[PDB]
Amino acid sequence: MRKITVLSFITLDGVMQAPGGPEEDTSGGFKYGGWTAPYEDEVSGKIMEKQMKPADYLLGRKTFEIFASYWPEHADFWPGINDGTKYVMSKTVKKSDWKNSVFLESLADIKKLKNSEGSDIQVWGSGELIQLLFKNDLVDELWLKIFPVTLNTGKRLFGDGTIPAAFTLIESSVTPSGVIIANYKRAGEVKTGTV
Amino acid sequence: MRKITVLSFITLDGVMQAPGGPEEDTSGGFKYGGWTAPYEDEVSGKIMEKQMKPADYLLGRKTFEIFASYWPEHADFWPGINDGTKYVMSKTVKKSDWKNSVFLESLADIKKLKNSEGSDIQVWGSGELIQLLFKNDLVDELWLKIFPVTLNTGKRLFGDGTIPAAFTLIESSVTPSGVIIANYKRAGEVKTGTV
Numbered sequence A, B: 001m002r003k004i005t006v007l008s009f010i011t012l013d014g015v016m017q018a019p020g021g022p023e024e025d026t027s028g029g030f031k032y033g034g035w036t037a038p039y040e041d042e043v044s045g046k047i048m049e050k051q052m053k054p055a056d057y058l059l060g061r062k063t064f065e066i067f068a069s070y071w072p073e074h075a076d077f078w079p080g081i082n083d084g085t086k087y088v089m090s091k092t093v094k095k096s097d098w099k100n101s102v103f104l105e106s107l108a109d110i111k112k113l114k115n116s117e118g119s120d121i122q123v124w125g126s127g128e129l130i131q132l133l134f135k136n137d138l139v140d141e142l143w144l145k146i147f148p149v150t151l152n153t154g155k156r157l158f159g160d161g162t163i164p165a166a167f168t169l170i171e172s173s174v175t176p177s178g179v180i181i182a183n184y185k186r187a188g189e190v191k192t193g194t195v
């Protein structure tokens, strides 16, 4: 059994669409692509150069294709994404000229990939696929970065597949720009009481 | 002009409904009332004290009525809510047995109260009213306690009134129970660039 970590950049109101640039994802006429862009300092770069250490990867086709247009040319900066196997969930794509790309089609294939032997799995972007991972409680860990911004519209990290669940805060951090790094571990069922 | 702070307990996916107990709010058949219970600790109380400072208050009718059913009988623990004026939005309730309760009926009234002279306004609970405040950009600070839990269903702090807007993280801490205190100042507009 492999660990599955979801890593995500979200706004205060949990919007995850198009962190990195104005055109990264225009679904809905989304106007705020690049909202992650004013909150990048050098200690943020060092916090997630360690988050970038080599692993295996699980991605939705759309996030795969956003990555495949850029990262094959920048293996200097992020070698992990280029060397590790990238398992990609898709029904419309079966091959890619990006090295070490495998294509899964089913919830069964994800479960086998998890049960199979090998390195821990990182999940970047992939909002729609994350919905399926959440709904089957396959997500073992959450690394989040919460930015001081609210954007009513936009694809969300906790969306359709969010289930009731509990977590442990493994560790946390803050950024000179005011970004909270939050690191949760899956922790069983939601507990209630009275205050 | 007065400083409208909004204070709110939210899950990781931003639900604020019924933090304190199982029957506190049962709209939609909400099964997770009291989800903040297992995360109450000592440090949390200390912060609660600085936020239980004598202020004026602005509340929605439902939150006022939940408060009025318990807090007038515990002026020792949380005085300020009994001593300060409570401005309550309603078109349903005109008077109350609680000392220092004023009843406002329009958006204009909330603005006039803001433009008035007096103590800085705290806002607790009041998701439906918060929506109107957000929509007209009357909220100036945000003190959030983010709890290590997810519950897909429930009333959301950032609901239909949320508007795109930037913030300045003025403070942050983590409790021994894994809750994230994060207070934000309102900071003008959303900036985008390219990473």
Ligand SMILES: NC(=O)c1ccc[n+]([C@@H]2O[C@H](COP(=O)([O-])OP(=O)(O)OC[C@H]3O[C@@H](n4cnc5c(N)ncnc54)[C@H](OP(=O)(O)O)[C@@H]3O)[C@@H](O)[C@H]2O)c1
Pocket: A007, A008, A009, A010, A016, A017, A018, A019, A024, A025, A059, A060, A061, A062, A063, A064, A089, A090, A091, A092, A093, A105, A124, A125, A126, A127, A128, A129, A130, A132, A155
């Ligand atoms: N906040 C961040 O950290 C971050 C980082 C990078 C990107 N992003 C954003 O993530 C978003 C990526 O777009 P997206 O989330 O809408 O799509 P996606 O999850 O990346 O991929 C969607 C595609 O993957 C397949 N897929 C996903 N879920 C499936 C399921 N449950 N069952 C079967 N196939 C499934 C399908 O491929 P087929 O159509 O081929 O069948 C689907 O069309 C963008 O907005 C991107 O900007 C965020």
Ligand SMILES: NC(=O)c1ccc[n+]([C@@H]2O[C@H](COP(=O)([O-])OP(=O)(O)OC[C@H]3O[C@@H](n4cnc5c(N)ncnc54)[C@H](OP(=O)(O)O)[C@@H]3O)[C@@H](O)[C@H]2O)c1
Pocket: B007, B008, B009, B010, B015, B016, B017, B018, B019, B024, B025, B059, B060, B061, B062, B063, B064, B089, B090, B091, B092, B093, B124, B125, B126, B127, B128, B129, B130, B132, B155
């Ligand atoms: N997470 C926390 O920190 C926290 C703390 C305490 C409570 N809560 C939760 O907050 C929720 C409070 O209930 P709620 O948010 O649904 O209602 P609410 O905002 O507390 O009050 C609803 C009533 O206030 C009036 N009102 C609100 N907005 C109005 C508007 N835009 N225009 C005119 N009148 C308006 C109306 O009164 P009339 O109908 O009388 O006209 C409305 O019916 C509960 O779920 C409670 O458990 C959360």
